[PDB]
Structures are given as structure tokens and as C-alpha cells.
């Protein structure tokens, strides 16, 4: 079940990468929960948080804190629930 248990075991959630000390990562999966907000998805495309693009995840401390990311064409603030639902390869 690649969906729930990814074959690529080195796939990590943006919020987990942020809390563990950030890093440069390739965007792989945007969950269905994120897709439900069109205005957010527009913002993610504009700044370049889309599958196949590299992003920079800013290191964060504490739970319930928004995760700052940098894309090829700007940066954006991900809510914890959104950040959790985006998966990347570091």
C-alpha cells in the first residue's frame, strides 16, 4: 500500500522535517485534505510548492506553530495540519 505505507521509506512530512531542524527537500505528495482549499492550492503553485520542485523547510520549535517554506518563486506559511499533509524527500 504505497498510499498509506510508502515503498520509498525516506519520504517525510514537512512538519516533522521542520521540527527536526529543517532542510532542502523535493516535494512528492500533497494529500487530498490540502487540495480541498482552492485559495491555498493557488498560493502553493505560485510560490512553487508542487510535486517535482525542491523547497527549503525553515526549522521551527513547538507544536501548533506555522511552518515557513521557501519555493523557487517565493515563500509561504503552512498551518501544522497542512504541513503534516505534504510529504517530501530530503
Amino acid at each position: 500500500g504505497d498510499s498509506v505505507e510508502p515503498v520509498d521509506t525516506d519520504l517525510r512530512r514537512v512538519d516533522e522535517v521542520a521540527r527536526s531542524g529543517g532542510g532542502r527537500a523535493l516535494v512528492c505528495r500533497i494529500a487530498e485534505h490540502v487540495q480541498l482549499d482552492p485559495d491555498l492550492m493557488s498560493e502553493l503553485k505560485k510560490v512553487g510548492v508542487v510535486p517535482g520542485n525542491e523547497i527549503d523547510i525553515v526549522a521551527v520549535a513547538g507544536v501548533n506553530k506555522p511552518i515557513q517554506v521557501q519555493g523557487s518563486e517565493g515563500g509561504t506559511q503552512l498551518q501544522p495540519g497542512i504541513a503534516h499533509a505534504v510529504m517530501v524527500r530530503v
Binding site: 505528495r29 500533497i30 510535486p51
Partner: peptide, 8 residues
Amino acid sequence: SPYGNPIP
């Protein structure tokens, strides 16, 4: 999918 989620 276009959003990178595997098709089961």
C-alpha cells in the same frame, strides 16, 4: 495523481 499521490 497530479498532486503526486499514488493511484491504488
